[PDB]
Amino acid sequence: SVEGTCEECSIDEDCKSNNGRWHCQCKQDFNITDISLLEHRLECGANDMKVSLGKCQLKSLGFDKVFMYLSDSRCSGFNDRDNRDWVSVVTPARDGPCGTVLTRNETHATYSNTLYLADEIIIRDLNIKINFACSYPLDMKVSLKTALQPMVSALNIRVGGTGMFTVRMALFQTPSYTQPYQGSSVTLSTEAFLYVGTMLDGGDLSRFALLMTNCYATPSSNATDPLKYFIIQDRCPHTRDSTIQVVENGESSQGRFSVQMFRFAGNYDLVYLHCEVYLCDTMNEKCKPTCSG
Amino acid sequence: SALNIRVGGTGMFTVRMALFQTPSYTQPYQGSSVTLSTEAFLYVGTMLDGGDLSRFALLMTNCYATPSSNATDPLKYFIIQDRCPHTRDSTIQVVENGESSQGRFSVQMFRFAGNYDLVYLHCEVYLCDTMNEKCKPTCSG
Amino acid sequence: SVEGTCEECSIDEDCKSNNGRWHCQCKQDFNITDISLLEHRLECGANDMKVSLGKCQLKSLGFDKVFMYLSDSRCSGFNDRDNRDWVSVVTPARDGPCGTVLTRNETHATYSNTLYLADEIIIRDLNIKINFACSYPLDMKVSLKTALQPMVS
Ligand SMILES: *[C@@H]1O[C@H](CO)[C@@H](O[C@@H]2O[C@H](CO)[C@@H](O[C@@H]3O[C@H](CO[C@H]4O[C@H](CO)[C@@H](O[C@@H]5O[C@H](CO)[C@@H](O)[C@H](O)[C@H]5NC(C)=O)[C@H](O)[C@@H]4O[C@@H]4O[C@H](CO)[C@@H](O[C@@H]5O[C@H](CO)[C@H](O)[C@H](O)[C@H]5O)[C@H](O)[C@H]4NC(C)=O)[C@@H](O)[C@H](O[C@H]4O[C@H](CO)[C@@H](O[C@@H]5O[C@H](CO)[C@@H](O)[C@H](O)[C@H]5NC(C)=O)[C@H](O)[C@@H]4O[C@@H]4O[C@H](CO)[C@@H](O)[C@H](O)[C@H]4NC(C)=O)[C@@H]3O)[C@H](O)[C@H]2NC(C)=O)[C@H](O)[C@H]1NC(C)=O
Ligand SMILES: *[C@@H]1O[C@H](CO)[C@@H](O[C@@H]2O[C@H](CO)[C@@H](O[C@@H]3O[C@H](CO[C@H]4O[C@H](CO)[C@@H](O[C@@H]5O[C@H](CO)[C@@H](O)[C@H](O)[C@H]5NC(C)=O)[C@H](O)[C@@H]4O)[C@@H](O)[C@H](O[C@H]4O[C@H](CO)[C@@H](O[C@@H]5O[C@H](CO)[C@@H](O)[C@H](O)[C@H]5NC(C)=O)[C@H](O)[C@@H]4O[C@@H]4O[C@H](CO)[C@@H](O)[C@H](O)[C@H]4NC(C)=O)[C@@H]3O)[C@H](O)[C@H]2NC(C)=O)[C@H](O)[C@H]1NC(C)=O
Ligand SMILES: *[C@@H]1O[C@H](CO)[C@@H](O[C@@H]2O[C@H](CO)[C@@H](O)[C@H](O)[C@H]2NC(C)=O)[C@H](O)[C@H]1NC(C)=O
Ligand SMILES: *[C@@H]1O[C@H](CO)[C@@H](O[C@@H]2O[C@H](CO)[C@@H](O)[C@H](O)[C@H]2NC(C)=O)[C@H](O)[C@H]1NC(C)=O
Ligand SMILES: *[C@@H]1O[C@H](CO)[C@@H](O)[C@H](O)[C@H]1NC(C)=O
Ligand SMILES: *[C@@H]1O[C@H](CO)[C@@H](O)[C@H](O)[C@H]1NC(C)=O
């Protein structure tokens, strides 16, 4: 048009501009013949089927006027009216109108129809008819979007059970803590080094650490005895004794303390070992006590 | 002389289902979620928003509920098993299925056993051609 | 079973015997509903927690098939396999598996989990969920059994 600017013509096709001579054409993108003959696009809709070809392709192929017809002449092509580059026709997805037929097999149905293309009403050299069909699945997945939150009169009852963990300690001979003892009693000398370690036979949670809050020896099996020799006092070993060394405590489930043998002063011949232990959570507590060792 | 070139296009039909309140199937819901009680009766129907061909009938091959939106879940409660409703539950009644495009099944609300609070509904459907298939399944209801 | 005698069925539940008609049921000991709803037993283990209810109670309450589930559906109930009267489920005493959580305070830690009971997958009238927890002391007394007899010059 001699009034509208580049917006007057389709954006896809270049808008040529010169003094006293304005027009719009296309580029190498849509310029060739053979691929244009092979060029097309199709759209299968829920209720309609659309087939379109580039109008610039038709113009370049010499088809200034385009006549699009189907098996039924009542169906006729027309401009896209949405994107001006294309020219398209519509066909209802049924059998009987617009010349469409229904091809059905067990898997899923299909609709087939033919499109006739020509430059004019009559055909002189080539009669190109496009055979096209849309396949619609006969089985499909459907999901309800809206979820549900049902209400029920529920009965909730608290149950509480006391539990106890399993804890044991062993007397090892070597500094490597290899062989536990099994006899009910043992004999040793003062110069002998008493290597002892503790273990949890169950509940070896990674975040639960073993911390010796305090340890002591007793002349008798009865823990409640006034004569106590604290080996670990308030999470740390007793000082003034170089022989007291602990390799690990609170690092993991394996808590080991090293000390040499001793004997209570008096008529007490037998010596027992007792300990108190606090399980430490690594999430919050550092579980690595530090003191004036 | 004529040139013929084959063209094919993958398409899909439009299918949707709605949750009605009344036994007459009048008002669909619109909210993303709803709350209900066990005694409440869950009336549901399915419709085709397009392609309402007279000879294509709607047949519920199987329906089931899922605790989550993901259909591929082992915990499935089949409400319709192989084109027929699950027995041992008098509350399961379907007014129409395969007669026309309007397939409706009636059941009362339920809740999955466990920690699952939300329940979803999924279905599979087979379109039936009235020309050849009777499309009126019969079974030991 | 039409082959095994009274030993075939659990001793706790009475074994009924008649010509052409044998079976086993229970007595007034396990027959009522309300106390059965209130009846249960729990066991807190060192590494596992067990909760069980009388199978005869479930049968008498109309729950011919029993579905026991927890906060995590991977955990499922099963027969006791030690005393056939009970039916029980197991849960490791940790946080994360089987839906269990860890409730901790300064005195001592505690593990809590919920048990879901139903006759079938779906629930129609009542949704009874049993909230249970085991308390494990965080401080405990340990004594070495083996005494010592040191030698001195
Ligand atoms: C019912 O009915 C219905 C109807 O509808 C059905 O269904 C259907 O079916 C049909 C048939 O099968 C189909 O079609 C097919 O397809 C396939 C696949 O495809 C592929 O590819 C593509 C591309 O191309 C892709 O993508 C696509 O695309 C499209 C476009 O194109 C679109 O549309 C869509 O969308 C897409 N897809 C989707 C899914 O979406 C796909 O994916 C696929 O992929 C891949 O690819 C590859 C490559 O290509 C492949 O491989 C290759 O292939 C070739 C062909 O292509 C060959 O085969 C070779 O060998 C191979 O290696 C693979 O495989 C795939 N994957 C899978 C499968 O997975 C296809 O494959 C086919 O093809 C065939 O066929 C055709 C026809 O039809 C033919 O063509 C022919 O050719 C010749 C030469 O060769 C000439 O001459 C002529 O002319 C032509 N035409 C006619 C014949 O017509 C071809 O070739 C082939 O054939 C054969 O093959 C063999 C092997 O096996 C050989 O050996 C032989 O040789 C041949 N033949 C001859 C003759 O030669 C077709 O195309 C449809 O699809 C359906 N539908 C649906 C919806 O799907 C049903 O089934 C019924 N039922 C009852 C029961 O009946
Ligand atoms: C960190 O967290 C741990 C959590 O484990 C905590 O340690 C536990 O604390 C609880 C609370 O103290 C302990 O359980 C209390 O035991 C008290 C004394 O023992 C009772 O009860 C035993 C049965 O529970 C019984 O026999 C025991 O039976 C077990 C089998 O079931 C067996 O395994 C065990 O060996 C055996 N022996 C024991 C345990 O020694 C005992 O023989 C003895 O009779 C008991 O008095 C307590 O009852 C009070 O507390 C509970 C809540 O814990 C209340 O329950 C509430 O009741 C309401 C109705 O009244 C109801 O609506 C609520 O739903 C319900 N639940 C709540 C509130 O959570 C009780 O009613 C009662 O509460 C108050 O009592 C006062 C005075 O009597 C009364 O005036 C109030 O009215 C009443 N409250 C209310 C709301 O009415 C518990 O049963 C547990 O034993 C501890 N664990 C261990 C391993 O010992 C730590 O302390 C905690 N630490 C910190 C720092 O926070
Ligand atoms: C095809 O592409 C050509 C681009 O070469 C379009 O116009 C041509 O422009 C060049 C400018 O360098 C001229 O030398 C050519 O003479 C032009 N083509 C002709 C045929 O004169 C052309 O418009 C595009 N479309 C068609 C249908 O040829
Ligand atoms: C509950 O206890 C009764 C005992 O009275 C069990 O069976 C009953 O046996 C008496 C025999 O005097 C019959 O008169 C009753 O008819 C029996 N009960 C029924 C329901 O018929 C009974 O098996 C026990 N358990 C249950 C679940 O009822
Ligand atoms: C341990 O000793 C204390 C006090 O000496 C006493 O009260 C307690 O009964 C004793 N216990 C045993 C088991 O000997
Ligand atoms: C659904 O669950 C299956 C298996 O449980 C899984 O393979 C799939 O990825 C899941 N899909 C979605 C969307 O969650």
Residue numbers in the entry:
A (entry chain A): 292 to 584
B (entry chain B): 444 to 584
C (entry chain C): 292 to 444
Task: Give the text the authors published on this PDB structure.
Here, we report a cryo‐electron microscopy study of uromodulin (UMOD)/Tamm–Horsfall protein, the most abundant protein in human urine and an archetypal ZP module‐containing molecule, in its mature homopolymeric state. Hepsin protease‐mediated cleavage of the CCS leads to dissociation of mature UMOD from the CTP and triggers its incorporation into homopolymeric filaments. These protect against urinary tract infections by binding to uropathogenic E. coli (UPEC), reduce nephrolithiasis, and are involved in the regulation of water/electrolyte balance and kidney innate immunity. UMOD forms a one‐start helix with an unprecedented 180‐degree twist between subunits enfolded by interdomain linkers that have completely reorganized as a result of propeptide dissociation.
D Representative micrograph of UMODe filaments, showing the absence of branches. K Sharpened cryo‐EM map of UMODe (4.0 Å resolution) in two orthogonal views oriented as in panels (D and E). Comparison of this map with that of UMODfl identifies density belonging to the N‐terminal half of UMOD (salmon contour in the front view of panel F), which is lost upon site‐specific cleavage by elastase (orange arrow). E Superposition of the UMODfl (salmon) and UMODe (cyan) cryo‐EM maps shows that only the former shows density for a globular domain protruding from the core of the filaments. This reveals the approximate location of the elastase cleavage site, corresponding to the N‐terminus of UMODe, within the structure of UMODfl (orange arrows).
